[PDB]
Design a protein around this nucleic acid. Structure first.
Lengths: 184, 50, 300, 202, 50
RNA sequence: CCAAGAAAAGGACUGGAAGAAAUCAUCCAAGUUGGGGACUAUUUUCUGCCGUAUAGGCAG
């Protein structure tokens, strides 16, 4: 469809902006205080990094598992082992996305955020590196449900099918097995 | 950026050159003079609306 | 500031060509040999039996920093005009002329080819003057020049001080230098920029090729007279809006310091006021030097 | 009738031109200990773009080649996991030969060489008593492809470059190798098998 | 060969107009609205009646 | 444990004959692309003998 696969609002959280300020931080506090604020910000941001690439990773998993041409689509289609080598490219795009945002103009490409962003991305990449019956075909089904109506086959017939299937399975498995519902 | 924040650029990043492709024209060595010529026609044509 | 503002260049050379004399003809070009090996190798050196090599170029100077080439704002224009004149009448063009003049007589525009057994520089101008530096190897950036040489620096400074400041004077200089050379000394002309390396040449009117130095390469050498930063003179920088230093890969007037051209451009109202109370400070010298190397100053 | 062994470089950042020069220097030193020997140098990974990350030695005397392999330098470089070494084995009988001739004529492409040539020519004329009147050649030359190997001088204060070309073999006469196991354009005939084959062994 | 365009020669020849503001200054290229390129403005704006 | 359970639509075939798209025609008038600029650096290519020789061959 030619559209961006990236999150439409991960950067719209005022907390994100604060988180960045906390990574940047301030003097005057003790080591414990600074570390606690810092680590908390980083954990938050870590989550945002996972969210930011979320729909993108979702696309990958869905499509690849189930069975074009843009890099944010093709580089994720590739082998998971390769993903760690995309870290610099992801980090680049990240700053750009901030650069294109109303608030991120104060932060993008700031030296202070370099290693933090790169490290958390690298971590994420390393980390990245009911009975369902499918495909059934029926030939010559009866399309006349009752003498009054043509259309979808009679539902009394599907309820019937669920049960004949249940009885056959029950004669095979010693344990009691029971079907509460059936979807079409 | 809008004469407000000076951009993030690290010191070393502006020492780089900016290459460009240009056309140019020079008089070759040992020519004594250059000539330029054109022609001009004048018509008495403001006396009547086209 | 405003949207449109431009100055054009007030000082410029044409290119430099290397040649030698024979008993049969006065201009024989120094040529370059190439082997295709495309991916080639090539060489250039003074051939046997030529005792000295000549290098020549021309220079025009124009009083063109007195007025904006383009300006879209009547208030910006009123100030820039008042400033150039406020400066001109207190002197200061003498200082700029002294700095430019010193570089021509020293010979640094020869770049990597300064290492001779003796270099002589001769200058002629359109007003009828002639200047002669018998030996250019001994003149420093900082120091007192030997007698009779200090004097020609003053005389040349005066002609150029006028060329830079009063209109309708058509001032040309013609600069020739002689390099007394070694047995088969290697010569270093400008290189070609490509996407092995190649050297640059020019065509003669008779079809021969010759070695040369590019115009802006001569120019970059002449305008290297910026030593107004950090109260430490060292050697001067090529004038640049950000104070770039290529050798160290850094920048001396980084915008972060408030010492670049663009911060300074906005204080013109204050400088004119000071000049009226006048001593000239480094801040106005820098600004005038940039206006001489004109360019685009836009999108304020 | 021929034996060889090969060495490969394990490090991805190895500079082939610098390193290859040391192996040749060793060969030379060995040649000085035992003047009556013949060992040739081959480049089984030779390419038109680069020199390649491997070197091989070829000769006819098995017992002598073993002695060369035992030289301490090679043993140290293997121990520290810089080199991968093969064993000595017989050269396959199903291959073609190449020369690996070196060309000193290429020296004349550089200014330093022309200067030296003329200085000697001037001085040489005094014996003749004629005025020194040199006569230069035209502007265009054509040469083949060559690679460089970095070399140190023998018991002196100099360093210089070896320029290597690869020629296809044609058979005639009898053989001999230069002090570097290289071939010369004339009066130094020899050849090596181009063992780009069976290189899966290292 | 290098050349100068026809209308570029023309613009120079017709640079004749110092009849505005009762102060000759420098002449403008004849233009229905009195355009002045160097200053990016116009001297005979319709609002003036001129 | 289904308006449940089982099921061979097959064999044959001639669309043909004939035809005139034509006559006419004016796209014109005016026009400023411009201003500024370093391809060389921590390079690898030196030192000699023979040969009338900037040819051709060689040791280190």
């Amino acid at each position: 469809n030619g559209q961006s696969l990236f999150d439409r609002s991960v950067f719209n959280d005022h907390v994100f902006i604060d988180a960045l300020k906390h990574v940047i931080s301030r003097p005057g506090l003790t080591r414990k205080q600074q570390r606690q604020l810092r680590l908390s910000a980083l954990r938050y941001l870590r989550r945002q990094l996972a969210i930011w690439l979320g729909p993108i990773i979702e696309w990958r998993d869905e499509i690849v598992s189930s069975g074009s041409g843009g890099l944010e689509l093709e580089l994720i289609t590739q082998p998971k082992k390769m993903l760690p080598e995309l870290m610099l490219q992801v980090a680049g795009r990240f700053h750009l996305e901030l650069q294109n945002h109303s608030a991120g103009r104060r932060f993008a490409f700031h030296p202070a955020l370099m290693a933090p962003i790169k490290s958390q991305i690298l971590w994420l990449l390393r980390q990245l590196a009911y009975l369902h019956l499918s495909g059934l075909t029926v030939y010559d089904a009866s399309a006349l449900a009752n003498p009054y109506l043509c259309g979808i086959p009679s539902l009394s017939a599907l309820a019937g099918f669920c049960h004949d299937y249940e009885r056959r399975l029950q004669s095979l498995i010693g344990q009691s097995v029971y079907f509460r519902g059936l979807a079409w | 950026d809008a004469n407000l924040k000076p951009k993030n650029i690290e010191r070393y990043e502006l020492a780089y050159s900016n290459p460009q492709t240009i056309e140019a024209c020079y008089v070759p060595p040992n020519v004594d003079e250059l000539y330029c010529r054109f022609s001009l026609r004048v018509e008495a044509n403001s006396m009547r609306p086209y | 500031l405003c949207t449109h503002l431009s100055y054009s260049r007030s000082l410029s050379p044409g290119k430099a060509v290397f040649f030698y004399k024979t008993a049969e003809s006065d201009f024989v070009p120094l040529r370059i040999e190439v082997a295709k090996i495309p991916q080639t190798i090539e060489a250039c050196y003074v051939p046997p039996n030529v005792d000295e090599l000549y290098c020549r170029f021309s220079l025009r100077v124009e009083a063109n920093s007195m007025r904006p080439y383009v300006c879209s704002n009547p208030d910006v224009l009123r100030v820039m005009i008042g400033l150039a004149q406020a400066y001109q009448r207190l002197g200061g063009y003498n200082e700029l002329a002294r700095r430019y003049s010193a570089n021509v007589l020293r010979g640094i525009w020869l770049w990597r080819n300064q290492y001779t057994q003796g270099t002589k520089i001769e200058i002629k101008t359109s007003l009828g003057s002639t200047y002669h530096i018998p030996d250019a190897r001994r003149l420093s950036w900082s120091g007192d020049w030997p007698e009779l040489e200090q004097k020609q620096l003053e005389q040349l400074t005066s002609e150029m001080a006028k060329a830079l400041s009063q209109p309708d004077i058509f001032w040309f200089a013609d600069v020739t230098a002689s390099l007394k050379t070694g047995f088969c000394q290697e010569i270093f002309p400008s290189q070609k920029f490509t996407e092995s390396r190649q050297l640059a040449t020019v065509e003669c009117s008779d079809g021969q090729l010759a070695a040369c130095i590019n115009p802006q390469k001569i120019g970059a050498a002449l305008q290297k007279i910026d030593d107004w930063w950090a109260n430490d003179a060292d050697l001067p920088l090529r004038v640049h809006e950000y104070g770039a230093n290529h050798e160290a890969l850094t920048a001396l007037r980084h915008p972060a310091t408030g010492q670049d051209f663009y911060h300074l451009l906005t204080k013109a109202e204050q400088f004119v006021t000071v000049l009226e109370s006048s001593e000239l400070p480094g801040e106005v010298h820098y600004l005038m030097a940039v206006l001489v190397k004109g360019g685009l100053f836009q999108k304020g | 009738n021929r034996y060889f062994f090969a060495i490969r470089y394990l490090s991805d950042d190895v500079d082939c031109g610098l390193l290859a020069g040391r192996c040749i220097s060793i060969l030379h030193g060995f040649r000085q200990a035992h003047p009556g020997i013949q060992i040739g140098v081959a480049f089984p990974e030779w390419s038109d773009r680069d020199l390649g990350r491997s070197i091989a030695f070829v000769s006819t005397n098995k017992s002598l080649l073993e002695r060369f392999r035992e030289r301490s330098y090679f043993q140290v470089m293997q121990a520290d996991n810089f080199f991968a070494l093969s064993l000595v084995l017989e050269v396959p009988d199903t291959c073609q030969n190449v020369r690996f001739i070196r060309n000193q004529n290429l020296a004349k492409l550089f200014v330093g060489e022309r200067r030296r040539r003329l200085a000697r020519a001037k001085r040489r004329a005094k014996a003749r008593g004629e005025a020194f009147q040199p006569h230069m050649p035209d502007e265009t030359k054509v040469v083949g492809v060559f690679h460089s190997v970095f070399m140190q001088s023998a018991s002196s204060g100099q360093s210089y470059i070896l320029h290597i070309q690869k020629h296809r073999y044609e058979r005639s006469e009898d053989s001999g190798y230069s002090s570097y196991g290289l071939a010369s354009n004339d009066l130094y005939t020899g050849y090596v098998p181009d063992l780009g084959a069976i290189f899966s062994t290292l």
